Design a protein around this ligand. Structure first.
Ligand SMILES: [Zn+2]
Ligand SMILES: [Zn+2]
Lengths: 142, 57, 289, 62
């Protein structure tokens, strides 16, 4: 199923341009669960603007309760897999760090290949994530 | 920094910059407020006198 | 899984300038045919000469290199054997199966300087003759200089030497389709559209003189300069013209240099691409059953 | 020496279009316009006709 689901809003872009042949550090924050997104995504193939609405999910598998693992590299279509989203990524978690000073200071470091993503928030929501886990990044702009 | 002539031009340029529509040389512009006042002039066409005789005593 | 079905459409067809389309296929069918048509199809060319007497200004080894580059005709090009495939006849003569003879003989005895031509090579077989304007000049003889030799031409693959290749320029392009965003065309003024039209290197984008609209005329001559996209990129309208090449629908501009016909070039190419892919599956058939 | 019969890169035969090039260069035509009358569209087969020394008229005197 879904381990974490939220609706964010684009705050600021770090390059803040168009057709820069690079990746944009799209900073986002929640409004109902007090989260913070730092996902890198290129604007050329997936256009994002300052101020929008998009849902984000994070599941350990895409078989929809049919298999507890991913499987091979090239996964064929089998038994109506979860394809309702538009932006699907894959990556492995590598670092879980905490911080003092505030209650919502537990960050989350994940790498979807060569990109990076920071998830700073309270430790109650990201408590279900272990170390060296194979996660997914389901996203859909609405 | 830039100082507009009136208040409606500023309120329109901020609404244009709030939708990320002001693109200049492939670089977005986020217009924000900053109290600098590089020219101390009142922004009003009725409070800017241009010719008035002044005497002292 | 199974095979494809390519569709063609010939635009113009004359001698050595055949132009045809090639739709519903990938690039490895338009490249693996060009790489065969430019180097693999065999013609005939002068290989071995035998100079008896040479009294001209140029050396006796400068003429043997120039005589081998003469574009001889070849109608029985695929029906003949090679020099190594023909173990008989021991070379050196008109075998009429793997070689042909030529006889050059000229002498300048008059006062003016006469130059020999490619129309002076007389062969014993009248089916292999040099094509012909003036013709290919070889030497220039003064009063008292003579030239007499004997050449032998044979069928050879154009991968060994650059004299057997009958295709000078055979290329292909992707033939892209361009689109114009009509919702953002009215943003720019007239002078911006004029400056955007004049920024193109080739005549790709025109202008309607009754409504001032950017109308696409002759889209097959874009040549991928990437000067129209970068012009609107550094302006007040990014993403105005999006250009992307098609994965299919290529066009071929072949040239056959007068040696063989342009229609027989792409036929002898696909008649040899059917036998190059033939000895591979029969030599790997005994390991399957 | 003399003009080569084929182009060094393309392979188009240009050994015969040398007398008719000097015959059109005898008039008031430009060197950039005398090649368009011989059907040469690429700049590979034009640098042979534009830049070539005629050494045989210096080598035929003796
Ligand atoms: Zn033979
Ligand atoms: Zn050339």
């Amino acid at each position: 199923i879904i381990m974490f689901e939220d609706i964010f809003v684009v705050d600021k872009l770090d390059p803040d341009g168009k057709k820069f042949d690079k990746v944009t550090r799209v900073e986002a924050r929640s409004h109902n669960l007090e989260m913070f997104m730092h996902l890198d995504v290129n604007t050329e193939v997936y256009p994002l603007a300052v101020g929008d609405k998009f849902t984000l999910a994070m599941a350990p598998t895409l078989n929809l309760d049919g298999t507890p693992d991913t499987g091979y590299f090239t996964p064929g279509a089998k038994k109506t897999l979860a394809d309702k989203y538009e932006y699907i990524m894959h990556g492995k978690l590598y670092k879980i760090s905490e911080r003092d000073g505030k209650t919502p200071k537990a960050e989350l470091y994940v790498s979807f290949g060569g990109l990076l993503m920071l998830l700073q928030g309270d430790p109650a929501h990201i408590s279900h994530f272990e170390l060296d886990q194979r996660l997914f990044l389901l996203m859909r702009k609405l | 920094r830039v100082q507009f002539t009136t208040l409606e031009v500023k309120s329109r340029a901020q609404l244009l910059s709030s939708q990320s529509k002001l693109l200049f040389k492939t670089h977005n512009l986020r217009l924000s407020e900053a109290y600098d006042d590089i020219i101390p002039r009142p922004v009003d066409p009725r409070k800017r006198l241009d010719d008035i005789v002044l005497t002292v005593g | 899984t199974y095979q494809r079905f390519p569709k063609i459409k010939i635009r113009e067809l004359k001698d050595d300038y055949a132009k045809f389309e090639l739709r519903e296929t990938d690039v490895s069918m338009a490249n693996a045919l060009r790489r065969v048509m430019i180097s693999e199809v065999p013609t005939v060319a002068i290989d071995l000469v035998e100079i008896e007497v040479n009294s001209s200004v140029l050396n006796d080894e400068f003429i043997a290199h120039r005589l081998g580059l003469i574009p001889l005709t070849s109608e029985r090009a695929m029906s003949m054997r090679f020099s190594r495939d023909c173990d008989a006849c021991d070379g050196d003569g008109q075998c009429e199966f793997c070689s042909v003879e030529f006889r050059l003989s000229s002498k300048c005895v008059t006062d003016q300087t006469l130059d020999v031509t490619s129309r002076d090579l007389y062969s014993a077989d009248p089916t292999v003759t040099p094509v012909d304007h003036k013709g290919i000049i070889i030497v220039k003889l003064r009063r008292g200089q003579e030239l007499k030799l004997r050449a032998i031409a044979r069928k050879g693959i154009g991968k060994d030497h650059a004299k057997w290749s009958p295709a000078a320029t055979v290329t292909f392009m992707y033939e892209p389709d361009i689109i114009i965003n009509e919702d953002m065309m009215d943003t720019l003024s007239d002078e911006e559209k004029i400056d955007l039209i004049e920024s193109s290197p080739t005549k790709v984008f025109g202008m309607d003189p009754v409504t001032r609209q950017v109308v696409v005329v002759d889209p097959e001559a874009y040549t991928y300069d990437e000067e129209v996209i970068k012009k609107a990129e550094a302006m007040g309208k990014p993403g105005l013209i999006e250009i992307s090449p098609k994965d299919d629908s290529f066009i071929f501009t072949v040239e056959s240099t007068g040696a063989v016909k342009a229609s027989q070039l792409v036929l002898n190419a696909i008649d040899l691409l059917k036998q190059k892919l033939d000895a591979v599956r029969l030599s790997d058939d005994t390991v399957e059953a | 020496m003399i003009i080569p019969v084929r182009c060094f890169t393309c392979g188009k035969v240009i050994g015969n279009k040398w007398d008719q090039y000097l015959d059109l260069l005898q008039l008031d035509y430009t060197e950039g316009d005398a090649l368009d009358a011989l059907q040469l569209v690429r700049y590979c087969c034009r640098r042979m006709l534009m830049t070539h020394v005629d050494l045989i008229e210096k080598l035929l005197n003796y």
